[PDB]
Amino acid sequence: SKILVIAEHRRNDLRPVSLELIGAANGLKKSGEDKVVVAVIGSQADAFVPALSVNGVDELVVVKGSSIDFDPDVFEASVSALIAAHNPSVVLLPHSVDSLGYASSLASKTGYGFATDVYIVEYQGDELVATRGGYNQKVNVEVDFPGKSTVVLTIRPSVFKPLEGAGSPVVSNVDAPSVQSRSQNKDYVEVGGGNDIDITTVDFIMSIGRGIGEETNVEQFRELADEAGATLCCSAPIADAGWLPKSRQVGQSGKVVGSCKLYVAMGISGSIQHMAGMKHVPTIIAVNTDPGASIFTIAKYGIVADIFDIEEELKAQLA
Amino acid sequence: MKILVAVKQTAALEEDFEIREDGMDVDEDFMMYDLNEWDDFSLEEAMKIKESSDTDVEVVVVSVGPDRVDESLRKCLAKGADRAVRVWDDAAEGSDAIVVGRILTEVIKKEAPDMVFAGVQSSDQAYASTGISVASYLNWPHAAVVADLQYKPGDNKAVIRRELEGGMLQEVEINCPAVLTIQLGINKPRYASTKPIEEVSLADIGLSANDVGAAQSMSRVRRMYIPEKGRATMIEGTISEQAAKIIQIINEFK
Ligand SMILES: Cc1cc2nc3c(=O)[nH]c(=O)nc-3n(C[C@H](O)[C@H](O)[C@H](O)COP(=O)(O)OP(=O)(O)OC[C@H]3O[C@@H](n4cnc5c(N)ncnc54)[C@H](O)[C@@H]3O)c2cc1C
Ligand SMILES: Nc1ncnc2c1ncn2[C@@H]1O[C@H](COP(=O)(O)O)[C@@H](O)[C@H]1O
C-alpha cells in the first residue's frame, strides 16, 4: 500500500510539519513493502526537492500548478489527481491553515474516509483507527472508516516525530490539472502594531488571557511583569481586542516562545492553538479558577485561584 | 442582496461529566448549550455589511440541530438577523461535518444567497470542516480563516486576509458568491454576553434518513472516553501561600 503525504511550504520555506507527516506515515505503514509518497505543490516547488529528499520518503512528486503558494482550488484538484495516480490507503495533510482551505472539500466530493486534527493513529489489523478530541479537548473520540479504501486525515502539528537523516526518493514532476482558480493570492502582510521585544528570544514570560476581564485590568499585570522581571505576553483575545500588541501574542497564529524557560499563564484556558506557542516551556505555572481548564494538563504547577488576588499578593511579596 | 450565516449551537461540559452507557458520547445531562463563539464574529461581519450598505442586505442565520437550537436562533434575531432557519429531523442525529455540509447546502440552494459565512471551527468538536464542505457541495469559491473582508454588496470579487501561522496574513482576491470561514478577531461583536424561527424538515429540502445521520458520515465513532491527561502539581492553601510558592519557583528559575 501507499501512504500519501502532502507537504507544506510558504514564502520559499518548507514548513517543518511536512517532516512530522513523513514520520507519521512511516510509523503507520503495515509492512516494509508499503511506500510513502510525498507531494509538494507549487509553481516553484522543485526548490523543495533537497529538503524533502529525506529518510522515509520513497517517492517525491513535484506538482506544478498555477500559484506559487497555497491556493485551495489548485490544491484540491492536485491532491485529487495524486490520489487517483497513487491509490493511497491513507492521505496525510497537516491540520494547518492551508489545509483548512480545502481538506473537507476534497472529502465531500468522493467516498473517502475523513477526520481532522488527529493526534493518535494506528492500524489494528487492517483497520485504520484515528483519535481526535471532543468537547473542547475534554474527551478523546476514537473513529474508524468502515469500507473506505482511501482515508484522508489532517494531522495535529507537533505530535508526530520526524525521522532523522537523508533519503533517496524517486523524484517525479507532474502538472496540476488545468482548471483556473476562483481566487488569486496577493500580498503577504505582517500582523500590525509595535515590535519593541522579540518574544521568541525571552526567557521569562507572564501571559494574560480573557480571564483578566476589562482592558483596565491590563495595567496591573504589566506592573507585575515589570516588578518580576518578566515579559508580558497574551492569548489571542487580548491582542485581537487591541489591548496588547500582536507581537506579544503566543500561539499558532502568534509566536512560539522558543527561548522561554518559565511561563506564567494567568486567565488562559489552554486552547490547543495557545499551547502550540508554549507547551515546550520547561516550567509552566497556570493560574486559573477553572480546574477543568486544559492548561493544567500541561502545567508543571497549578493554582486554582483568582488571578487578581494572586497578582496583588505576588506584587506585595515581591516588594 | 442576502448573506447566509451558518451557525452552530455548541455544547460545553460541566465538571464531573460522564460518558454515556453506550460509550459513544457524553451524557447530555452534563451539557450547557450556547452559540458557537466563531458565529458571533461571522454574524457581526454580516451585520457590518448590512449597516455599511445603502442597499438592503437580508441576513439569514441557519442551523442544523434539534429544538434546543431555537434559543440561539432567537438571540441572533434579537441582534438583528432578519430571518432564522432551523433544519432538523431525528434521523439527522450523528451527522458529521460533511453530512451537515450537505444539509446546509440544500437550504442554501433555495435561499440563493450572495455570500455564505461559516465559523472557522466549532468550540466543541473543532472539526474546522463544515463551512468548506458547504463550499464543495455548492461548488463555490472559498477561503478559510478570514480575518479581514473587503466587500460591497453586488461586487463580483472581494478581498480577504487569511490569518496564517506565525504572525502573518495573506491577502486573497476571491470571486463572489463565495463561502468564507470567519476567524475570531475579525471584528468586535457588539452584544457580547414576535418573528418566529422558520422550521424546516428533511422532507422540506428533499432529503431522507438515508442521506443523513451517523451511517452517512465519513468516519464512525468507535467510542468516546475521558483520556488520562497530564497532571499539574496543584498548590493549595491561602493566596499568600500560593503566591509564596510562585516566588520560590521564580527564584529557583532566577
Ligand atoms: C486557526 C486558529 C488560530 C489560533 N491562534 C491562536 C493563537 O495564536 N493564540 C491564542 O491564544 N489562541 C489562538 N487561537 C484562539 C483559541 O481558539 C482560543 O480562542 C484562545 O486561545 C482562548 O484564549 P483564552 O484562554 O485567553 O480565553 P478563554 O478560553 O475564554 O479562557 C479564559 C480563562 O480565564 C479563566 N478565568 C476567568 N476569570 C478568572 C479569574 N478571575 N481568575 C483566574 N482565572 C479566570 C477561565 O477559567 C478560563 O479558563 C486560534 C484559533 C484558531 C481556530
Ligand atoms: N449543525 C450546524 N448548523 C449550522 N452550521 C454549522 C453546524 N455545524 C457546524 N456549522 C458551521 O461550521 C462552523 C463550525 O465548524 P466545524 O468545526 O467544522 O463544525 C460553525 O461556526 C458554523 O458556521
Which residue type sits at A54?
V
Q: Of the ligands numbered here, which is closest to the C-alpha atom of B93?
A: 2
**B230 labeled binding residue:** no
Residue A4 class from Cβ within 10 Å (0-12 exposed, 13-18 middle, 19+ buried)? buried
- The domain segmentation of chain B, as residue ranges, is 1-254
Residue A200 has φ and ψ, to the nearest 5°, of -75, -10
The three cell numbers locating residue A238: 487580548
Which spans in chain B are helix H?
37-52, 70-78, 97-111, 130-138, 239-253
> Taking CB atoms and an 8 Å limit, are B247 and A133 in contact across chains?
no
B193–chain A Cβ distance below 8 A for any pair: no
Distance CA A170, CA A148 (A): 28
Elucidation technique: X-ray
CB of A252 closer than 6 angstroms to any ligand 1 atom: yes
> How far lies A21's CA from each of A57, A105, A193, A231, B209, in Å?
11, 20, 34, 34, 37
Distance CA B20, CA A293 (A): 22
CA of A218 to the centre of ligand 2 (A): 33
B233–chain A Cβ distance below 8 A for any pair: yes
CB of A211 closer than 6 angstroms to any ligand 1 atom: yes
CB of B35 closer than 6 angstroms to any ligand 2 atom: no
Which residue type sits at B120?
V
Q: Measured in whole angstroms, how far is the alpha carbon of residue B214 from the centre of its chain?
A: 20
Helix, strand, or coil (residue A108): helix
User: In ligand 2, which atom is closest to the CA atom of B126?
Assistant: 17
B8–chain A Cβ distance below 8 A for any pair: no
**B99 labeled binding residue:** no
CB of A259 closer than 6 angstroms to any ligand 1 atom: no
- A189-319 — its CATH code? 3.40.50.1220
- The domain segmentation of chain A, as residue ranges, is 1-188, 189-319
Residue to substitute in A96, A271, A279 for testing ligand 1 pocket (most ligand atoms within 8 angstroms of CB): A271
A235 to chain B: which residues are within 8 Å by CB? none
Residue whose C-alpha cell reads 447530555 in the numeric block: B28
Nearest-neighbour CA in chain B from A36: distance (Å): 23
Contact B145, B162 (CB under 8 A): yes
Distance CA B18, CA B228 (A): 14
CB of B39 closer than 6 angstroms to any ligand 2 atom: yes
> Taking CB atoms and an 8 Å limit, are B224 and A296 in contact across chains?
no
Distance CA B45, CA B68 (A): 25
Which spans in chain A are helix H?
17-28, 49-52, 72-86, 97-100, 103-109, 218-228, 236-240, 272-278, 307-318
B235–chain A Cβ distance below 8 A for any pair: yes
> Taking CB atoms and an 8 Å limit, are B246 and A310 in contact across chains?
yes
**B88 labeled binding residue:** no
Spelled out in words, what is the top-level CATH class assigned to the domain B1-254? alpha beta
Rg (CA), chain B: 21
Residue whose C-alpha cell reads 494538563 in the numeric block: A297
CA of A116 to the centre of ligand 2 (A): 14
Which residue, A168, A170, A158, A160, is CA-closest to A55? A168
> Taking CB atoms and an 8 Å limit, are B218 and A133 in contact across chains?
no
Which residue type sits at B240?
S
Which residue, A17, A60, A26, A59, is CA-closest to A40? A60
Largest CA distance in chain A: 68
Q: Do domains A1-188 and A189-319 have the same CATH topology?
A: yes
Give CATH superfamily name and number for A1-188: HUPs (3.40.50.620)
Contact B123, B241 (CB under 8 A): no
Residue to substitute in B184, B193, B235, B242 for testing ligand 1 pocket (most ligand atoms within 8 angstroms of CB): B184
Which spans in A29-172 are helix H?
49-52, 72-86, 97-100, 103-109
Residue of B123, B170, B226, B249 to mutate for A, most A C-beta atoms under 10 A: B170
Distance CA B212, CA B152 (A): 36
Largest CA distance in chain B: 67
Write b or e for each residue in A223-260: b if 16 or more Cβ atoms lie within 10 A of its Cβ, otherwise e: ebbeebebbbbbbbbbbbeebbbbbbbbbbbbbbbeeb
> How far lies A46's CA from each of A12, A157, A180, in Å?
11, 24, 22
